[PDB]
Amino acid sequence: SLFEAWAKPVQPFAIWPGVWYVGTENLSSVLLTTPQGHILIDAGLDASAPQIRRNIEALGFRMADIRYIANSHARLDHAGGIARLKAWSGARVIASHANAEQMARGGKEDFALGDALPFPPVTVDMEAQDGQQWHLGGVTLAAIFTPGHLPGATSWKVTLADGKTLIYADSLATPGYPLINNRNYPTLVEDIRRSFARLEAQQVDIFLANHGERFGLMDKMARKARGENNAFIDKAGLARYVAQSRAAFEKQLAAQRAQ
Ligand SMILES: [Zn+2]
Ligand SMILES: [Zn+2]
Ligand SMILES: [Zn+2]
Ligand SMILES: [Zn+2]
Ligand SMILES: [Zn+2]
Ligand SMILES: [Zn+2]
Numbered sequence: 376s377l378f379e380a381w382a383k384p385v386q387p388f389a390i391w392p393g394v395w396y397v398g399t400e401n402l403s404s405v406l407l408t409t410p411q412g413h414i415l416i417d418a419g420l421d422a423s424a425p426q427i428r429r430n431i432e433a434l435g436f437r438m439a440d441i442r443y444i445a446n447s448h449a450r451l452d453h454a455g456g457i458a459r460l461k462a463w464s465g466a467r468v469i470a471s472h473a474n475a476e477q478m479a480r481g482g483k484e485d486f487a488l489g490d491a492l493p494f495p496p497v498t499v500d501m502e503a504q505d506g507q508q509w510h511l512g513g514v515t516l517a518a519i520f521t522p523g524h525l526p527g528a529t530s531w532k533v534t535l536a537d538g539k540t541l542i543y544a545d546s547l548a549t550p551g552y553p554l555i556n557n558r559n560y561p562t563l564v565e566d567i568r569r570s571f572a573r574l575e576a577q578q579v580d581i582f583l584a585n586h587g588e589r590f591g592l593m594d595k596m597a598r599k600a601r602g603e604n605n606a607f608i609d610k611a612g613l614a615r616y617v618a619q620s621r622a623a624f625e626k627q628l629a630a631q632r633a634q
Pocket of ligand 1: 448450524546
């Protein structure tokens with residue numbers, strides 16, 4: 376029922392020329408539109424897939440014009456709807472190796488959740504490597520591997536046609552994670568530390584994240600509706616996101632080491 380609250384619909388809107396929000400109240404889904412086809416970053420829950428397509432069409436765009444679907448990490452609140460969106464799309468799915476493996480499993484054998492939260496399996500069509508780039512209609516999409524929350528967690532850097540940089544950040548949360556000598560994910564700590572360094576060295580004009588509460592979705596949305604054209608321009612958003620995630624992580628790790 377917390378996913379129920381996260382999946383409450385929002386009216387789609389423009390974040391920026393060529394950048395559209397088509398997700399829910401707290402589960403992000405971003406459509407990048409170009410004259411050569413579109414990119415969809417993340418999907419949400421399987422139950423929200425009809426709402427996502429519905430949102431895309433309410434903006435005046437066609438599912439058949441979506442060429443790529445990118446995934447941040449392969450859990451149900453972001454990959455759950457990809458299977459059906461892929462089918463309605465004909466699009467090719469992009470994801471890191473570890474995300475591809477988990478998505479083929481339907482979310483099962485999660486290093487922390489086991490088989491607790493499955494979703495429709497997906498076949499990834501294009502395996503993403505760190506720093507790999509895709510070009511479409513003047514837009515560039517680049518993968519930034521940011522593991523920690525999951526072994527394959529991926530952030531996404533978009534260079535828009537107008538030259539401005541967008542960063543779609545994956546989660547860095549580790550609630551309830553065993554951080555010291557984790558049997559199922561032994562490289563977690565070094566992974567998340569490299570992720571902090573990678574993200575904090577990234578310049579950004581438009582800061583987004585796969586959970587709306589973490590980049591002020593509802594506040595920025597209301598502000599833009601009232602006429603603030605640049606409400607989603609947030610050049611300090613990623614630095615603050617990393618600082619607060621790192622602060623919480625180091626406190627959690629310090630507590631785990633103080634047995
Ligand atoms: Zn997650
Ligand atoms: Zn989760
Ligand atoms: Zn999530
Ligand atoms: Zn692979
Ligand atoms: Zn494999
Ligand atoms: Zn199993």
